[PDB]
Design a binder for these strands. Structure first.
Ligand SMILES: [Mg+2]
Ligand SMILES: [Mg+2]
Ligand SMILES: [Mg+2]
Ligand SMILES: [Mg+2]
Ligand SMILES: [Mg+2]
Ligand SMILES: [Mg+2]
Ligand SMILES: [Mg+2]
Ligand SMILES: [Mg+2]
Ligand SMILES: [Mg+2]
Ligand SMILES: [Zn+2]
Lengths: 53, 55, 124, 96
RNA sequence: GACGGAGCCAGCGAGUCUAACCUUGGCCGAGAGGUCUUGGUAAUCUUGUGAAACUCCGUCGUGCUGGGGAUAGAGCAUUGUA
RNA sequence: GCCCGGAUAGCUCAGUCGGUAGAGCAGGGGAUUCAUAAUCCCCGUGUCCUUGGUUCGAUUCCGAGUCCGGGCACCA
């Protein structure tokens, strides 16, 4: 109803976040994972990203 | 406004160029505090009973 | 005499025609960036503004500048229809009152309102 | 919160029937999946419902998992009148 | 060695569903780009990613030079509500 | 009340053949420290006293005057 409370949010750092934690910053956007790097390091095992080399 | 800004002498480059440069420009890091890092300021201390209850 | 000086020309058009030409025909003769801005976005833009603007130009006390008309629209391109108006061109705080001249055609409002105070190194 | 009683009924009813709700943490949605109201309405109505018992709330990955409690079953039972032992997710479907 | 013709060879990647991503081909355009179609959710299509240094035949010829391309003026297009 | 000594950055102190102004201290900011010190750097800074004169050029070569600074309680 209130025609006053949004401005574009289609693109840029403001148009997304961490599916895990809201953070707009240091976002992993590759392969559609969309996790912030801090989180991605804590989840990378359960996602299936392991350490080989 | 803009009329002001162009009309204002005491502005632009020549004017700065002709001023001396302060010495705090060519300063140094500062540091302030470091050989106090291990020295606790809290003035509080714990106590063997509280630590022994905890751990 | 006879020759009351002579008018201005935007890019080969003397005032007279420019004034009653149409915004669209004006940008037609404008340069790249302008022609682009106007090309995209045609749905409601410098809207009530002009109305107010013109109303002020009517409410003008004769032979004199119309009252200022404040905006934040630093992005608005200057076109014939707004020639001879007075606009409060915000710079962050402050609306810088500016009258619009024939030779300002096609520039942004924001160019005419400075956004920072110069500098002044050293000094005291 | 502040919301017309009708939407409050959509929420409460849906909730009683389902016994469980989810809502992405995003106010400003306008309509949420399923229930026909503002996401904000769901989230707040629920939150209230919870802080007086009635519902348990879990969060995890931006998402709010809403669980209907027993005392709560009694409560919305009152709010929709519907006679003692009405329903909820409290019967094992066909024989699934 | 710069410029100009011409020769002409990689590997690791990545790409569009409830969407507009990787884009071949045809035309138009000095260029940037435009436009009509198209293949691909992929060892299948873009893509042999014909990459750049490099190779060859020319022009220049030691001169701030045709080395260098900062700064600046005018015009044209692309992303984007801007 | 003398005589003495001054004046330029806030202050303390340099200067000039007369070309274009400095230094310390102060200040402000970094570096070094878990954090402060020390230390080691950075920065910024000027109504050239008033008051006139001299002078191709003067803060800067004079003069006059005013704040003052050092030493001594009205004998032509
Ligand atoms: Mg919003
Ligand atoms: Mg300003
Ligand atoms: Mg070549
Ligand atoms: Mg052409
Ligand atoms: Mg297709
Ligand atoms: Mg290959
Ligand atoms: Mg040379
Ligand atoms: Mg060249
Ligand atoms: Mg530390
Ligand atoms: Zn995160």
């Amino acid at each position: 109803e209130n025609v006053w409370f949004s401005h574009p949010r289609r693109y840029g750092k403001g148009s997304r976040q961490c599916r895990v934690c809201s953070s707009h910053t240091g976002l992993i956007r590759k392969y559609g994972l969309n996790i912030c790097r801090q989180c991605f390091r804590e989840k990378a095992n359960d996602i299936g990203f392991n350490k080989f080399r | 406004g803009n009329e002001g800004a162009i009309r204002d002498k005491t502005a632009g480059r020549r004017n700065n160029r002709s001023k001396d440069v302060t010495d705090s420009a060519t300063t140094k890091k500062s540091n302030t505090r470091r050989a106090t890092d291990r020295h606790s300021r809290t003035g509080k201390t714990d106590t063997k009973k509280k630590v022994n209850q905890g751990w | 005499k006879k020759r009351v000086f002579k008018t201005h020309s935007y890019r080969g058009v003397d005032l007279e025609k420019l004034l009653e030409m149409s915004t669209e025909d004006f940008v037609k003769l404008a340069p790249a960036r302008v022609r682009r801005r106007f090309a995209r976005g045609m749905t409601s833009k410098p809207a009530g503004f002009m109305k107010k603007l013109r109303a002020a130009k009517l409410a003008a006390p004769e032979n004199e500048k119309p009252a200022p008309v404040r905006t934040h629209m630093r992005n608005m391109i200057i076109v014939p229809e707004m020639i001879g108006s007075v606009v409060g061109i915000y710079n962050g705080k402050a609306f810088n009152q500016v009258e619009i001249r024939p030779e300002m055609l096609g520039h942004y409002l924001g160019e005419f309102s400075i956004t920072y105070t110069p500098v002044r190194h050293g000094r005291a | 919160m502040l919301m017309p009683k009708e939407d409050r009924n959509k929420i409460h009813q849906y909730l009683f029937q389902e016994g469980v709700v989810v809502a992405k943490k995003d106010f400003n949605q306008a309509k949420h999946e399923e229930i026909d109201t503002k996401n904000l309405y769901v989230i707040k109505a629920l939150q209230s419902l919870t802080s007086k018992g009635y519902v348990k709330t879990q969060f995890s990955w931006q998402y709010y998992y809403y669980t209907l409690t027993e005392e709560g079953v009694e409560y919305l039972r009152e709010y929709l009148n519907l006679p003692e032992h009405i329903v909820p997710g409290t019967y094992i479907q066909e024989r699934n």
